[PDB]
Amino acid sequence: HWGYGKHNGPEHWHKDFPIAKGERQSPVDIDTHTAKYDPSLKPLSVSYDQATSLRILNNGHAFNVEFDDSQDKAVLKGGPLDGTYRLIQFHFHWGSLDGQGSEHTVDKKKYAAELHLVHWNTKYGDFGKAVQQPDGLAVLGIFLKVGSAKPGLQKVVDVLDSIKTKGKSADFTNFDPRGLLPESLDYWTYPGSLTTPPLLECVTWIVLKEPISVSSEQVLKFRKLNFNGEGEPEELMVDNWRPAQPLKNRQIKASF
């Protein structure tokens, strides 16, 4: 199956998922000089005060912190969005080195990692139906650079020991995602896709301009995770990022 190795990595995905060469694939390089300020964009609204996290899972390609999305508790709205999108999970993509790891790039610059807060359009009833719609998901992307530690991320870093291998999960209640947000909500937005198979073209991407900083020790712990399951040969979970894809017929808009 698909992965990030030499024989099943991003350049191989198109064989099982033809949409990999589609018209609105993600991630993309964000050319800051070509992105245009869009005055029609409404302010972004991130309401995570009532967010209810439940568990953290190592799924073989990243670790997801999952939330209870059976009620409107943590929602994203505004910005380029019409309607309300509910937070279902967040995960990261990172590298083997601080010089790479992000999926989106800024003027070709690669960050050490990238956080994806995934939300689905409540008008479609559930995540499974939303991914079958062009405007089914809204994903907030946040870059990570190495420098000072991010206090709000430590709880995540500390539990990784308990989900080292694929298929392992652990209770992860009362985690506040507001602790992973940068100060400014200025962003770039464009229509795209999931960056992992099935690569469905159902995402309105909202990528924040301001990165958050995490410590060398924090990202170091990410790199100790495994792509493999327990009892299998150990392959470190690193470089689980898809590279930039052709922008094709799309315009990236800036909120600033």
3-class SS at 106?
strand
116 near Zn ion (CB under 5 A): yes
Chain center to CA of 73:
20
Q: Beta strands of 48-161 (E only): which ranges?
A: 53-58, 63-67, 75-78, 85-94, 105-106, 113-121, 137-146
Q: What residues have CB less than 8 Å from 189, skipping those under 6 apart?
A: 41, 79, 80, 204, 205, 206, 207, 252, 253, 255
Cβ closer to Zn ion: 104 or 116?
116
206 near ligand OCc1ccccc1 (CB under 6 A): no
74 near ligand OCc1ccccc1 (CB under 6 A): no
61 near Zn ion (CB under 5 A): no
Q: Compute the radius of gyration of the chain from its Cα atoms.
A: 17
CA distance readout (Å), 175 to 55, 65, 145: 9, 9, 22
Min CB(202)–ligand OCc1ccccc1 separation in Å: 9
Helices (H), the chain: 13-16, 127-130, 154-159, 216-222
Cβ closer to ligand OCc1ccccc1: 118 or 244?
118
Residue 91 annotated as binding site: yes
Q: What residues have CB less than 8 Å from 98, skipping those under 6 apart?
A: 112, 146, 216, 219
Residue 1 annotated as binding site: no
102 near ligand OCc1ccccc1 (CB under 6 A): no
240 near ligand OCc1ccccc1 (CB under 6 A): no
Return the residue of 53, 58, 102, 196 that touches ligand OCc1ccccc1, per CB under 6 A.
196
255 near ligand OCc1ccccc1 (CB under 6 A): no
**What does DSSP say about strands 29-30 and 105-106: parallel, antiparallel, or unpaired?**
parallel
Min CB(233)–ligand OCc1ccccc1 separation in Å: 26
Residue 195 annotated as binding site: yes
46 near ligand OCc1ccccc1 (CB under 6 A): no
> Which of ligand OCc1ccccc1, Zn ion, none does 118 bind, CB closer than 5 to 8 A by kind?
ligand OCc1ccccc1
118 near ligand OCc1ccccc1 (CB under 6 A): yes
Q: Which of 136, 142, 137, 138 is nearest to 185 (CA)?
A: 142
- Residue 61 is a catalytic residue: yes
Q: Assign 3-class secondary structure to 224-256.
A: CCECCCCCCCCCECCCCCCCCCCCCCCCCEECC
194 near ligand OCc1ccccc1 (CB under 6 A): yes
Min CB(149)–ligand OCc1ccccc1 separation in Å: 26
Binding-site residue numbers for Zn(2+) are 91, 93, 116
**Annotation: binding site:** 91, 93, 116, 195-196
Residues that bind ligand OCc1ccccc1 (CB under 6 A): 116, 118, 137, 139, 194-196, 203
Residues lying near Zn ion in the complex (CB under 5 A) are found at 116
Q: Which residues are catalytic?
A: 61
